[PDB]
């Protein structure tokens, strides 16, 4: 509406655009690592609810699609283990969960696509290695789109700013001219 | 066909098997149940000069100490190190 208001929004959406881009780049590297680790994890995999996701949002419909234990801080806050997702999952993570004790996880397909004794620890591990590959791809995807949406909003807001900037000057001048005439 | 993997490495996609129980596989495995092992390694990577140091260190905590099932964990570590 007013130049000061747009000024603050513009600085805000400019920061977001940059952060979303950097977050896309971190997730791209995290996915690159995860997809490499998923290869030997699948061949190993071949041979109560409770719900598998992570602590971190900004990954689209990863948490919502999978949503009394739940691995991931998002699972319990929406509906217990914390500190998952940030560091790639290990078999030790699966053991911790199994020791504290269907299985609901996001299965990796591609960068865009994903779908919802000792072998007990194997199944938890399988779900973990698939989940993070899906989560890192989905975050990379969502942040790419967010950074694009931020870009288009920066342009739209900059145009509104400049039309308002010009209109303010023109209006002030017309009031001055009218008073003088 | 025969499949042999750890959670991180694939070795194969007669087999001598230790029963799992820490020991040698001839086509070193830690434990588990296609042969599934928590840690499967060479054989080139193992030392072995430091496993003797690990065995003696585990036999040092055994003469502790004391409280049951602690203890039972120490003995398992002694069994893995002896193999």
């Amino acid at each position: 509406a007013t130049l000061k208001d747009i000024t603050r929004r513009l600085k805000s959406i400019k920061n977001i655009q940059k952060i979303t881009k950097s977050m896309k780049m971190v997730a791209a590297a995290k996915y690159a690592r995860a997809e490499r680790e998923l290869k030997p994890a699948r061949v190993y995999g071949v041979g109560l609810i409770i719900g598998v996701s992570s602590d971190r949002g900004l990954c689209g419909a990863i948490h919502s699609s999978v949503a009394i234990i739940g691995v991931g801080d998002k699972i319990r806050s929406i509906l217990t283990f914390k500190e998952v997702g940030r560091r790639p999952p290990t078999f030790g993570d699966a053991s911790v969960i199994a020791l504290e004790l269907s299985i609901i996880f996001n299965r990796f397909r591609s960068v865009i696509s994903y779908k919802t004794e000792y072998s007990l620890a194997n199944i938890i591990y399988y779900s973990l290695k698939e989940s993070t590959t899906s989560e890192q791809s989905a975050r990379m995807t969502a942040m790419d789109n967010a950074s694009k949406n931020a870009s288009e909003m920066i342009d739209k807001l900059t145009l509104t700013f400049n039309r308002t900037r010009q209109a303010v000057i023109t209006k002030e001048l017309i009031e001055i001219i009218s008073g003088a005439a | 066909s025969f499949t042999f993997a750890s959670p991180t490495q694939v070795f194969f996609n007669q087999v001598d098997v230790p029963t799992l129980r820490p020991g040698l596989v001839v086509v070193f495995v830690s434990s588990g149940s296609q042969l599934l092992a928590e840690e499967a390694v060479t054989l080139d990577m193992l030392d072995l000069g430091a496993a003797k140091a690990n065995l003696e260190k585990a036999q040092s905590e055994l003469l502790g100490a004391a409280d049951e099932a602690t203890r039972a964990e120490i003995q398992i570590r002694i069994e893995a190190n002896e193999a």
Binding site: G92 | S31, E39, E68, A72
Partner: peptide, 25 residues
């Protein structure tokens, strides 16, 4: 019955200890 399975313990803890002893060597 195995000694580790008396006061405790699971085979998951067995394998966890054995796997770590391989890494540390």
């Amino acid at each position: 019955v195995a000694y580790w399975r008396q006061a405790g313990l699971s085979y998951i803890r067995y394998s966890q200890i054995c796997a770590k002893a391989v890494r540390d060597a």
